[PDB]
Amino acid sequence: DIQMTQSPSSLSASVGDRVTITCQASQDISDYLNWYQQQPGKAPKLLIYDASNLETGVPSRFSGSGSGTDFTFTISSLQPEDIGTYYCQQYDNLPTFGGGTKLEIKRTVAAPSVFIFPPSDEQLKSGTASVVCLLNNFYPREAKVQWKVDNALQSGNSQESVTEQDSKDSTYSLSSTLTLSKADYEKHKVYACEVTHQGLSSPVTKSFNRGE
Amino acid sequence: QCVNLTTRTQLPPAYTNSFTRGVYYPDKVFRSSVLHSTQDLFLPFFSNVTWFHAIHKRFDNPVLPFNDGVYFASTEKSNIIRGWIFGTTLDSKTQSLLIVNNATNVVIKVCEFQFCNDPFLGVYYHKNNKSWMESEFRVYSSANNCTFEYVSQPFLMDLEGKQGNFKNLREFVFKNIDGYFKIYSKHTPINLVRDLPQGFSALEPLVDLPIGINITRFQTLLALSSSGWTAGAAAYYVGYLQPRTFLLKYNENGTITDAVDCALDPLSETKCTLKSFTVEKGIYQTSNFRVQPTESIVRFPNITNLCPFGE
Amino acid sequence: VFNATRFASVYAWNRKRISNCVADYSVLYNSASFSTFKCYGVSPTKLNDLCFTNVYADSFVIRGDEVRQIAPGQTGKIADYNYKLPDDFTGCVIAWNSNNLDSKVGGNYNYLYRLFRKSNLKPFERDISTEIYQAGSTPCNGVEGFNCYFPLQSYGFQPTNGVGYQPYRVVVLSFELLHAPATVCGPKKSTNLVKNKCVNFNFNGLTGTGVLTESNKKFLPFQQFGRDIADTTDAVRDPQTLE
Amino acid sequence: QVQLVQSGAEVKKPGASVKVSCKASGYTFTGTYIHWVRQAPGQGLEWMGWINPNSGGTNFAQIFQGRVTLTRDTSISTAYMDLNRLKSDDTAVYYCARDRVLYGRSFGWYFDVWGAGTTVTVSSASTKGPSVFPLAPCSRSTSESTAALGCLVKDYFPEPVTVSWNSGALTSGVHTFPAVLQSSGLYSLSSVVTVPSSSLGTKTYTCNVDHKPSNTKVDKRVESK
Ligand SMILES: *[C@@H]1O[C@H](CO)[C@@H](O[C@@H]2O[C@H](CO)[C@@H](O[C@H]3O[C@H](CO)[C@@H](O)[C@H](O)[C@@H]3O)[C@H](O)[C@H]2NC(C)=O)[C@H](O)[C@H]1NC(C)=O
Ligand SMILES: *[C@@H]1O[C@H](CO)[C@@H](O[C@@H]2O[C@H](CO)[C@@H](O[C@H]3O[C@H](CO)[C@@H](O)[C@H](O)[C@@H]3O)[C@H](O)[C@H]2NC(C)=O)[C@H](O)[C@H]1NC(C)=O
Ligand SMILES: *[C@@H]1O[C@H](CO[C@@H]2O[C@@H](C)[C@@H](O)[C@@H](O)[C@@H]2O)[C@@H](O[C@@H]2O[C@H](CO)[C@@H](O)[C@H](O)[C@H]2NC(C)=O)[C@H](O)[C@H]1NC(C)=O
Ligand SMILES: *[C@@H]1O[C@H](CO)[C@@H](O[C@@H]2O[C@H](CO)[C@@H](O)[C@H](O)[C@H]2NC(C)=O)[C@H](O)[C@H]1NC(C)=O
Ligand SMILES: *[C@@H]1O[C@H](CO)[C@@H](O[C@@H]2O[C@H](CO)[C@@H](O)[C@H](O)[C@H]2NC(C)=O)[C@H](O)[C@H]1NC(C)=O
Ligand SMILES: *[C@@H]1O[C@H](CO)[C@@H](O[C@@H]2O[C@H](CO)[C@@H](O)[C@H](O)[C@H]2NC(C)=O)[C@H](O)[C@H]1NC(C)=O
Ligand SMILES: *[C@@H]1O[C@H](CO)[C@@H](O)[C@H](O)[C@H]1NC(C)=O
Ligand SMILES: *[C@@H]1O[C@H](CO)[C@@H](O)[C@H](O)[C@H]1NC(C)=O
Ligand SMILES: *[C@@H]1O[C@H](CO)[C@@H](O)[C@H](O)[C@H]1NC(C)=O
Fold this sequence. Notes:
This is part of a larger assembly, with 1 copy of chain A, 2 copies of chain B and 1 copy of chain D.
Chain A: E1 4-6, E2 10-13, E3 19-25, E4 33-38, E5 45-49, E6 53-54, E7 62-65, E8 70-75, E9 85-90, E10 101-105, E11 113-117, H1 121-125, E12 128-138, E13 144-149, E14 152-153, E15 158-162, E16 172-181, H2 182-186, E17 190-196, E18 204-209
Parallel strand pairs in A: 2-10
Antiparallel strand pairs in A: 1-3, 3-8, 4-5, 4-9, 5-6, 7-8, 9-10, 11-12, 12-16, 13-14, 13-17, 15-16, 17-18
Chain B: E1 14-18, E2 20-24, E3 34-42, E4 47-55, E5 58-59, E6 63-65, E7 70-76, E8 81-87, E9 96-101, E10 106-111, E11 113-115, E12 121-124, E13 133-137, E14 140-143, E15 148-151, E16 166-177, E17 180-192, E18 200-209, E19 217-222, E20 234-240, E21 242-250, E22 256-261, H1 266-274
Parallel strand pairs in B: 2-18
Antiparallel strand pairs in B: 1-4, 3-21, 4-5, 4-20, 6-19, 7-16, 7-20, 8-9, 8-19, 9-10, 10-15, 11-14, 12-13, 16-17, 17-18, 21-22
Chain D: E1 3-6, E2 10-12, E3 18-25, E4 34-39, E5 45-51, E6 58-60, E7 68-73, E8 78-83, E9 92-98, E10 113-114, E11 118-122, E12 131-135, E13 146-156, E14 162-165, E15 174-176, E16 180-181, E17 187-196, E18 205-211, E19 216-222
Parallel strand pairs in D: 2-11
Antiparallel strand pairs in D: 1-3, 3-8, 4-5, 4-9, 5-6, 7-8, 9-10, 9-11, 12-13, 13-17, 14-18, 15-17, 16-17, 18-19
The structure holds a molecule of 3 linked components (NAG-NAG-MAN) (2 copies), a molecule of 3 linked components (NAG-NAG-FUC), a molecule of 2 linked components (NAG-NAG) (3 copies) and 2-acetamido-2-deoxy-beta-D-glucopyranose (NAG) (3 copies).
């Protein structure tokens, strides 16, 4: 095979910044490379072909360059429609894709608004319990959530879902869900989640007890 | 599906006379009140044309030569002759041309066909609705690399008929010259029981297919538990074109109304040399005769050793 | 026709039918990309002044050394068993060096040609047969044998190859001129029809001088012109209103 | 107007097979290769193979060779991909894509026109409708300034559940997070909204949940304890 690697797995860039993303082939590929953009929730679109030939009707800002093992794709000044995953693809021997580079809009730092949500009476009536820790409107993606009961750190029994970047103000949101049996839920008094994030001066704890 | 229908009765090959038929408009130009001399592939006058027919029993659809070109005429009622196969081996070793008028549209195709050893179409007859249905098309089993296809805009022909005589004479000329398969045709209304109608008519061009294949043979397609059937009554006639001068008469309306085959007999050669369809009393000089070669000779000095060009 | 990604192999040359359209050839002839542009019964400057009964484009790839065999009346293994022009050819042969499109660093072995045939093929015939050739006096059967061959060979196009061994794309444009009702024409604008006055007329590229008048002649649908004993045109069917 | 139109979402058991179709229009269907490319949930593209619609010839990536079968009906300009003995990580979006008609190199594949993509889901789980639970902060008196509240949609399998607030009358500050595929094989997602603490006395918030595979339309009114 020809294995291909893209150097930034993701790249945060401001509106008007210059973006450069590099694709390297394991073999020498001459100029037998194409580049495709995938905007969130659509099929890919061909942008550059033959390593540097710009396709019909695509914006003049997009460029491709280099030959041999190492290649580049460039956006001369980024525009907020350019946000997506960019994939390189060789055509020397069976058309293999690269791992993709996600672009995202760069923004200033912002703290998460933190909420916690107890299991409803209808949910506890099913014989299962789940409790949700919600982080709303923050920017540096990497927010880490710690789940505790009676000050003991939990693991594997919780999972987190992160939004795509909000088009209106370039910001993320996520929640973590912790899940327990109806028997496992009732035997602990204190329920907490703690968020550690670049947009906070120190970690913040949200918590409750059964009842109130 | 493919099947070899076997309940046929053996007859010897019949023949009939092509009086003055299978002349056609030689080029796409208007002319009127003129006698025009043209050299082309034409069916010779009074030539011996092979005669085929379906009845009761009989259904003769054999593979025939196709050499220099073909004149084909079907005398008819009830639309029994519907097309042709043309090619060189008819079995997917080479390309071949299918032309076929199924009941709803004409399809023309050039593919590496595996044709049946006995190709036909079939009509389910009179069945309860008092109507006749095409339901069978046993022409080929495979059609790989189709480099030309055409399918006509749809119609719906009548599949029924019973009358004591034929009503339609439908005539064709086929030529396969420098990659182009040229079709000329005419339809004439008639009343006859059993022969190629004696008379004169000129065929107009109707298509010029860019097929690009070798044609050496051809076979016609006819309309009929897979054996035991009735063939509908129809006849068709085949004769080969030859490179020959004709003198054509165009009338004042600019239609070919008569012709002289310029080598039929010595009088036709005088009509053709005088450029007139009537000849006054006299003695006329014509094309000089000359005996042609019986065989070739070569006589070179007998030498076995090759020349030392390598040295 | 000229910028499609994948041209045909020369043993299986593709034919495209051009019809019911305006053909400005001046852009093709003025473009210095074409290494060959040879016309065999018309001038390449006159192609815009004209109409054509039918037009075809034959497209294929060959080696620069075989481009001479695409001319009419030629001999050699492309002219013999791949692509023959008629000795009376009318049309234009157009060719350009496709080393940026049809050459691969390991060889683009996708472009076949016929290497053997029992005899040379007819003008505009296409040989697609893959049956095993016999060179010796012995018969040969199955897939292979001694003095037997597969009849197709592949061209080894690499961008390293010497001048004349690179690939060339060929389009042969072929047509029949001024005889019949045209559906491909150069970019000329029509005037109104002037009758009963002496005029310089031009019908479908049939230029002339004369008094035009209403005719009682009926042409059949396949006829565009009428001629005299002297071969001169003496009637015509107007191409916009079919009088 | 060149286009490739595909079959709707496919849902399958392990060890079965799936028949994605790709109806072409706006160009001569025999002119160029049709490639088949797939994309697993939240992961990169993967080329499976091509068919040349003129010759019926095909080539496959080695992982799929002996699994994928590519075919085509030229009479209806439709290319097909058949994938056999399906495993859980064959859950993916499957695209057909055309190989560039003009200006390329004669070898090169490309993918210039893409179909809309067909989601295939390969898993043991049966079709099931969502159970929808209200989310509210803690108590009414522990709320402050801007509150957040929501509904959690739990244990439903035929993928694509749609959530909307007050029949679509409320959209400012709404989220509906991407679903998580649980260890039981059933999906879940959380949908949430921000509102002033002052508006909870004026109006009430209802999440409306539509799950088409189960024909299950369910509405939850969300109220602060
Ligand atoms: C005579 O042979 C013909 C060629 O095989 C065959 O033509 C096929 O007929 C069907 C039905 O009329 C057509 O069906 C399609 O028609 C249009 C196409 O735009 C669509 O609106 C329809 O939904 C449908 O898809 C086929 O298109 C046509 N085949 C081809 C290649 O065009 C006739 O049916 C044959 N006649 C009889 C009596 O069997
Ligand atoms: C006419 O139709 C033929 C049948 O569809 C088609 O045959 C195809 O020929 C190619 C070239 O040999 C085959 O390609 C494979 O050949 C062998 C297979 O064992 C391998 O050595 C090659 O690497 C390659 O895999 C196709 O498989 C074959 N198609 C079929 C269905 O058998 C002709 O080529 C067609 N004629 C044309 C396009 O002019
Ligand atoms: C000139 O020589 C070429 C080939 O060179 C010789 O090829 C061998 C036969 C052997 O002598 C080597 O040491 C030389 O290098 C001849 O070309 C051949 O021609 C025959 C037909 O006569 C053909 O079957 C072969 O395929 C050709 N092979 C090659 C490599 O060209 C050529 O015939 C010689 N010319 C003369 C006048 O002898
Ligand atoms: C129809 O009949 C012909 C001849 O009766 C069959 O042709 C034979 O085909 C086999 C192979 O299948 C050959 O071994 C024979 O030598 C052929 N015979 C002749 C005389 O050529 C043909 O196969 C039959 N087809 C069907 C569908 O019945
Ligand atoms: C040329 O064609 C015209 C019709 O276009 C023929 O004219 C008809 O002739 C008959 C017999 O003389 C008359 O009864 C009709 O009234 C005529 N019709 C018209 C419209 O004039 C004419 O006869 C043909 N000439 C030849 C030599 O065949
Ligand atoms: C068209 O097809 C015929 C029949 O296959 C070809 O004729 C054969 O040609 C070879 C040439 O070496 C001869 O050995 C055979 O004796 C011929 N067969 C017959 C029945 O005469 C013909 O050559 C093909 N046309 C062209 C241009 O090649
Ligand atoms: C036609 O040719 C055959 C011999 O092939 C002969 O028997 C028959 O009598 C001929 N017919 C005429 C009208 O000469
Ligand atoms: C009768 O005609 C109808 C349609 O007209 C058709 O569906 C049916 O098969 C026909 N039956 C027979 C026995 O021909
Ligand atoms: C060309 O257009 C004119 C009107 O603009 C019309 O009368 C004529 O029928 C058209 N030409 C043809 C060949 O139909």
